[PDB]
Design a protein around this ligand. Structure first.
Ligand SMILES: Cc1cc2nc3c(=O)[nH]c(=O)nc-3n(C[C@H](O)[C@H](O)[C@H](O)COP(=O)(O)OP(=O)(O)OC[C@H]3O[C@@H](n4cnc5c(N)ncnc54)[C@H](O)[C@@H]3O)c2cc1C
Ligand SMILES: Cc1nc2c(=O)[nH]c(=O)nc-2n(C[C@H](O)[C@H](O)[C@H](O)CO)c1C
Ligand code: SF4
Length: 512
């Protein structure tokens, strides 16, 4: 008789561990434990969401005839940790085998690997069939090509899945439609609202418990709208197909002060805990393309994010090992500035995106990359500090998908290891791709003076102090040509003004 453990990001009735259990003999185990709610200061909505999806997933299995042992975060004898809770079940149920799908973070794998030695019982750790690449396939694909790019990997995934494939060639005779393409942003009022799901009896009781036990944690619980059931996630899926998919590629890089969502799917939360399955999400997009419902560039652009980037980040996470988090190519040591936790700044773009994060635990891609992520980079923040923030604040964050986005893509803390170019940009970009500057106190056209946006001076300071590590980068080559053309006292004034702002952040970091 078997003890099946299921982790909080594995809430799927065909997870690897349920393959061939005996509903009479065996016992599924789920547990809310303090070790996983507290290894980082998660956003309140993140904890509430995960807890509520677990309690709902527990009810799901029970209705399907499974023996389910559930341990609540506040239960009397809660042991506090996976190891502890599995121990309590072993004296309780005395199984002859523990079954578990492989976890999604290094830390958790560490604990899972200590099970067998610590309990003297067979532990069967199963590989996670939700992912198209095993660790073994990806390692071997990476070996025999000393340069890693998503594009060459994504090519393989299209072949392997047959998604958007005419047997042997890609639909429309291009793997990529990057893009068909761009163009400025519009506050389209004739745009449907993204779905919201009002909290039920379970979710309300978890909302109350989270506010009682994690009172000093990041984020507001008000306006909880996440789907916590499988049915509601599949409704979030079909609403995106029906209402937003056909404009996905059009508005992809745009930011609107008044539109936190535009045309994105808002599914990462569900895909990443098993409520939605990645390959089914992709097939629905493709099914919609063949029924005329969206253009080729929106669908391929959308599938590219899932079977391309998300699958590739996972691969990069395990390939790089646990100390990838120590990557600090630029040798930064500055603390994460204070307003990342308060939203209280006069940089209108930083204030909007951080306020959105506070209140919804969501911000879409270009926001994570070019607002908060770009500022961190230019300001020279310790990448470990940035990594903690991104893992804590967003309700779709687990280390495997967060860490390579932060270290590799955003902060370039690994010197371009995962193939991307560096995303440093001045306030010229933000003015082009948003309306944030319109109501901002600074001017995105000024570099010096009391009301220049600090992204401008910080942009050039960042190129100037790291010139040695970046001069050979055929992407910054034009900026450096622009730098050298500036008179000497101008380059001096820009770097002094960069320092004045840098000083103002360090002064604040000291008061705490
Ligand atoms: C600094 C930084 C931190 C990030 N942290 C996370 C994170 O913690 N969790 C997370 O899931 N994504 C993360 N991303 C990737 C991306 O920003 C999010 O997937 C996206 O915001 C999810 O929103 P959505 O579901 O509306 O995406 P959409 O724009 O609707 O994208 C469609 C789907 O593609 C997937 N996807 C898109 N981009 C990526 C990517 N770069 N890597 C992996 N999957 C992707 C998501 O599953 C998403 O649901 C991060 C990106 C950056 C630049
Ligand atoms: C906040 C939180 N709480 C739990 C929990 O109570 N029980 C659980 O099984 N999982 C939780 N998780 C997700 C895990 O910490 C971890 O990040 C995933 O297991 C990734 O493999 C999270 C993120
Ligand atoms: S000006 Fe520079 S600072 Fe003010 S919003 Fe535009 S970008 Fe943010």
């Amino acid at each position: 008789s078997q003890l099946v453990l299921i982790l909080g990001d594995q809430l799927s009735p065909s997870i690897a561990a349920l393959d061939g259990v005996d509903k009479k003999q065996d016992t599924i185990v789920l547990c809310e434990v303090m070790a996983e709610a507290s290894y980082v200061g998660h956003h309140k909505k993140k904890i509430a969401f995960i807890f509520s999806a677990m309690r709902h997933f527990a009810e799901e299995l029970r209705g399907e005839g499974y023996r389910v042992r559930y341990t609540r975060i506040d239960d009397a004898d809660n042991a506090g940790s996976f190891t502890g809770e599995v121990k309590r079940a072993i004296d309780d149920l005395t199984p002859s085998r523990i079954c578990v799908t492989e976890p999604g973070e290094w830390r958790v794998r560490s604990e899972m690997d200590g099970f067998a030695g610590a309990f003297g019982i067979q532990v069967d750790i199963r590989s996670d069939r939700r992912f198209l690449s095993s660790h073994g396939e990806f390692r071997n694909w990476a070996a025999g090509r000393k340069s890693l790019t998503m594009e060459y990997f994504y090519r393989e995934m299209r072949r392997k899945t047959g998604l958007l494939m005419n047997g042997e060639q890609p639909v429309g005779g291009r793997w990529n439609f990057d893009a068909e393409n761009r163009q400025p942003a519009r506050p389209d009022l004739l745009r449907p609202k993204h779905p919201v799901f009002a909290p039920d009896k379970i979710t309300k009781e978890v909302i109350d418990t989270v506010e009682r036990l994690f009172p000093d944690n990041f984020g507001k619980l008000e306006n909880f709208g996440f789907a916590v059931t499988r049915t509601d996630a599949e409704r979030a899926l079909s609403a995106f197909i029906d209402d937003f998919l056909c404009n996905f590629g059009a508005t992809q890089d745009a930011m609107l002060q008044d539109d936190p969502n535009l045309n994105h799917s808002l599914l990462s939360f569900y895909i990443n805990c098993g409520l939605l399955d990645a390959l089914d999400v992709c097939k629905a997009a493709e099914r919609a393309y063949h029924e005329g419902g969206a253009p080729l560039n929106a669908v391929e652009g959308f599938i590219r994010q899932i079977i391309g980037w998300r699958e590739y980040m996972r691969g990069i996470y395990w390939l790089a090992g646990p100390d990838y988090v120590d990557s600090n190519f630029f040798e930064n040591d500055r603390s994460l500035p204070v307003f990342y936790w308060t939203g209280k700044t006069h940089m209108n773009c930083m204030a909007k995106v951080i306020t959105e994060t506070i209140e919804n635990a969501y911000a879409h891609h270009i926001q994570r990359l070019m607002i908060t992520g770009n500022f961190a980079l230019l300001a020279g923040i310790d990448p470990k500090a940035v990594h903690r923030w991104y893992l804590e604040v967003y309700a779709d964050a687990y280390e495997w998908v967060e860490l390579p986005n932060v270290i590799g893509m955003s902060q370039f803390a690994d010197g371009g290891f995962l193939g991307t170019k560096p995303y440093a940009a001045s306030g010229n970009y933000i003015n082009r791709m948003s309306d944030y500057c319109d109501t901002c106190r600074y001017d995105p056209k000024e570099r010096l003076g009391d009301n220049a946006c600090p992204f401008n001076a910080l942009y050039w300071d960042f190129l100037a102090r790291n010139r040695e590590k970046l001069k050979s980068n055929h992407r910054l080559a034009q900026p450096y040509a622009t730098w050298a053309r500036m008179s000497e006292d101008v380059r001096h004034d820009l770097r002094a003004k960069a320092a004045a702002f840098l000083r103002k952040l360090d002064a604040a970091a000291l008061e705490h």
